[PDB]
Amino acid sequence: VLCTNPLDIGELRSFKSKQCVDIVGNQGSGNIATYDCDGLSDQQIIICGDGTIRNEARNYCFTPDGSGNANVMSSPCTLYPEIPSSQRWRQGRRKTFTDNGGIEQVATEIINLASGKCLDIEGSDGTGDIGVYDCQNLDDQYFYVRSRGPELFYGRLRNEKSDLCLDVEGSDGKGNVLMYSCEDNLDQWFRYYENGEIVNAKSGMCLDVEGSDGSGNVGIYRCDDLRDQMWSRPNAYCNGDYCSFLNKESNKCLDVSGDQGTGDVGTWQCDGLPDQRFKWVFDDWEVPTATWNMVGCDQNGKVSQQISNTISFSSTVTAGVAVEVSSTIEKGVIFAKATVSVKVTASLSKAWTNSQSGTTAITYTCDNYDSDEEFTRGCMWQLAIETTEVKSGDLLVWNPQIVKCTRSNTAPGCAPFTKCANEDCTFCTDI
């Protein structure tokens, strides 16, 4: 039912305008066009290994509305008799570029399997309605799944002067940022990326300075890709594990009013005082490891099984535990002795977060191998992710509804969010 073999999850953006590919409203169904990236789950696009393109708000598919140069909308996925070629997409030619945040991105044509037409934005400026059109090589026919680069750090941010935490007023992760007692609420948890964004765990929005010039009051606001939402954490400004954050637009320090570390937060001329340094506060979890478990095999037909999302742990997987685990996964995961790519860890982290508020069991059938050929025999494999909370020694095992269908009794040789390159899955593409 859901996409069991995803390749990537994130914002799908125009190479040309850098706008998000957007479904009208926030429910994950309706017309598709460009829009400002607004952090809602419908703009979390799922690139499925079966060729479909879906989203995190609703299990619907990018679909052309008819033949020829048609409009594209988010519509119900046709599953029977099979997924039609018209709801399936391949990648065409590629263009790479370094974005304003300094991250290497990879854009490609996105080409409909039925028509051979390119996903397209009306006109040439990369803004407006989205349909399918003759592939004509213009930049607005190239799309990338936005990478933030690696997650560098995460946790609450404890002030060196006051030992209070960087706080957002209330508990929804929206609004003014100020110093407050450290609390077991998610609005105090942030994740800091190579692109410079510091993203609030509760709201998914960005640490922001009022206006555009990087000087003034700090709060949480829609992530807008601007330089005043980019922060550096230079070694020079650290004192052990307490470091300053300098705004990229203004070169001013993240600052607490006065010198006691207790008041409102803004940006100000760096002054080297302890109230301008903060330490990341988080619990140690071991680097997670990914493996595949055999669910069933059939040497002379397709395999069909109930697939559940399950988690095992010594205590409750609270919102607190879940944020620790998500942030741990994003930092790095091991598969077959090697680290996986940034897009694998970003996507796995998103899958984990989206797995917390279930999740019912599905009946899944291996109709095709992960490599795309018709499944006539082989095994179904389900992902397992293991980590350990260091302070307790307690093992956490996560079995998401992520599956690989292969021709082989040998476990897949490919990490989740990468594609088996052959039927036996001995090497990989889309790493």
Ligand SMILES: CC(=O)N[C@@H]1[C@@H](O)[C@@H](O)[C@@H](CO)O[C@@H]1O
């Ligand atoms: C909150 C909400 O639903 N926002 C959506 C936004 O994401 C975008 O799709 C826009 C298109 O006109 O429609 C709404 O404003």
Ligand SMILES: CC(=O)N[C@@H]1[C@@H](O)[C@@H](O)[C@@H](CO)O[C@@H]1O
């Ligand atoms: C010495 C002292 O308190 N300096 C602070 C400075 O660090 C900054 O917070 C500024 C904000 O307006 O207020 C004071 O001047």
Ligand SMILES: CC(=O)N[C@@H]1[C@@H](O)[C@@H](O)[C@@H](CO)O[C@H]1O
């Ligand atoms: C040169 C140019 O802008 N061509 C666009 C084309 O790319 C496509 O979007 C089409 C859809 O109707 O509109 C045309 O105006």
Ligand SMILES: CC(=O)N[C@@H]1[C@@H](O)[C@@H](O)[C@@H](CO)O[C@H]1O
């Ligand atoms: C639709 C999609 O996933 N596109 C590309 C993907 O193919 C891969 O190259 C990746 C590397 O991070 O970047 C993405 O932008």
Ligand SMILES: CC(=O)N[C@@H]1[C@@H](O)[C@@H](O)[C@@H](CO)O[C@H]1O
């Ligand atoms: C339960 C709750 O929302 N508490 C918040 C607190 O976390 C802090 O942000 C404070 C700042 O004045 O505002 C309170 O409303």
Ligand SMILES: CC(=O)N[C@@H]1[C@@H](O)[C@@H](O)[C@@H](CO)O[C@H]1O
């Ligand atoms: C165009 C512009 O500068 N918009 C800023 C916005 O980025 C955000 O900082 C907001 C916070 O209130 O203030 C606005 O004035």
Ligand SMILES: [Ca+2]
């Ligand atoms: Ca939307």
Ligand SMILES: [Ca+2]
């Ligand atoms: Ca166009």
Ligand SMILES: [Ca+2]
């Ligand atoms: Ca708060």
Ligand SMILES: [Ca+2]
């Ligand atoms: Ca701003």
Ligand SMILES: [Ca+2]
């Ligand atoms: Ca100060």
Ligand SMILES: [Mg+2]
């Ligand atoms: Mg459209």
Ligand SMILES: [Mg+2]
């Ligand atoms: Mg403030």
